């Protein structure tokens, strides 16, 4: 038994989560208004943006239950409500990754192969891919209702017995970490690399026709934000699922992992209030109002 002191998380969560609920509720809703009767343009990019915005709003509407439970330390409702809350939380967290990777692949397809992509870029394929993403992220949270959640104060999704962590949860972590983080990262990095390489050449425009610098800066920031808000949480999740199976024996690494896990999952939530500011409210075409 390695002594760790991680009692700070209960007040670490409940404060800052609240701030996010304050910010992510006003921003994203405004986006919906701008996409309702202000912009009046319909193509693929608008489809992807509206799906991403609605996914983030659905993610927002689940925080209050976590805040209330983490402040009061009591859950007198039952297993079903806690299971539903957790499943909604993680599904809406992991749909956003795919809705960003789609935009990156679309940009790579449109400004690297401009001739061979006059048949591959239609609205019907946009809707098909959106339905595919929704179906994959809803049907992937199937074994979240096959475990005992609740263990006068009744907690849920905490203090799981060590038997469960190596029979049902580690496999779910493997599935999420294969089909949820590595492939999107590879696709996003490779596509943005090729696009940046293509646009950085004294051959591929009209002799300083427009301001390419703004395009380059925006495409460069859209990669740093994605590659910083998400990687630490997944790496630490892998390490945590390894520690809880007693695969690492050293006390230093165990204590470090346990005390570092709450520090991340606080950066990754903050992605809810970066997206509506960097993707839109920065492009000139949607800065007409």
């Amino acid at each position: 038994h390695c002594f760790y002191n991680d009692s700070f998380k209960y007040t670490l969560y409940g404060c800052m989560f609240s701030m996010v609920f304050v910010l992510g509720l006003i921003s994203n809703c405004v986006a919906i208004y701008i996409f309702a009767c202000v912009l009046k343009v319909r193509n693929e990019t608008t489809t992807y943006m509206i799906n991403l915005a609605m996914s983030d709003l659905l993610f927002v509407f689940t925080l209050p239950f976590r805040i209330f439970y983490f402040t009061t330390r009591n859950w007198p409702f039952g297993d079903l409500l806690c299971k539903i809350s957790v499943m909604l939380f993680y599904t809406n967290m992991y749909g956003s990754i795919l809705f960003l990777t789609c935009i990156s692949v679309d940009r790579f397809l449109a400004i690297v192969y401009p001739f061979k992509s006059k048949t591959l870029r239609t609205k019907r394929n946009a809707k098909i891919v959106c339905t595919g993403v929704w179906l994959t992220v809803i049907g992937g949270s199937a074994p979240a209702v096959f475990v005992q959640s609740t263990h006068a104060s009744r907690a849920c999704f905490e203090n799981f017995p060590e038997a469960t962590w190596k029979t049902y949860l580690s496999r779910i972590v493997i599935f999420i970490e294969i089909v949820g983080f590595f492939i999107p990262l590879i696709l996003n990095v490779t596509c943005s690399s090729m696009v940046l390489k293509t646009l950085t050449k004294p051959v591929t425009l009209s002799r300083s026709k427009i301001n390419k610098t703004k395009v380059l800066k925006m495409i460069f920031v859209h990669l740093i934000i994605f590659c910083f808000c998400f990687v630490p949480y997944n790496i630490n999740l892998i390490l945590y699922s390894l520690v809880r199976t007693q695969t690492f024996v050293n006390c230093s690494v165990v204590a470090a992992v346990r005390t570092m896990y709450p520090i991340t999952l606080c950066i990754a939530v903050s992605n809810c209030c970066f997206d509506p500011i960097v993707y839109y409210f920065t492009s000139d075409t949607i800065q007409n109002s």
Binding site: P114, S206, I286
Partner: peptide, 16 residues
């Protein structure tokens, strides 16, 4: 022609 089409795509993607 390739440069013109790329120029129009850069506006179709809301990047400009």
């Amino acid at each position: 022609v390739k440069d013109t089409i790329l120029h129009d795509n850069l506006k179709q993607l809301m990047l400009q």
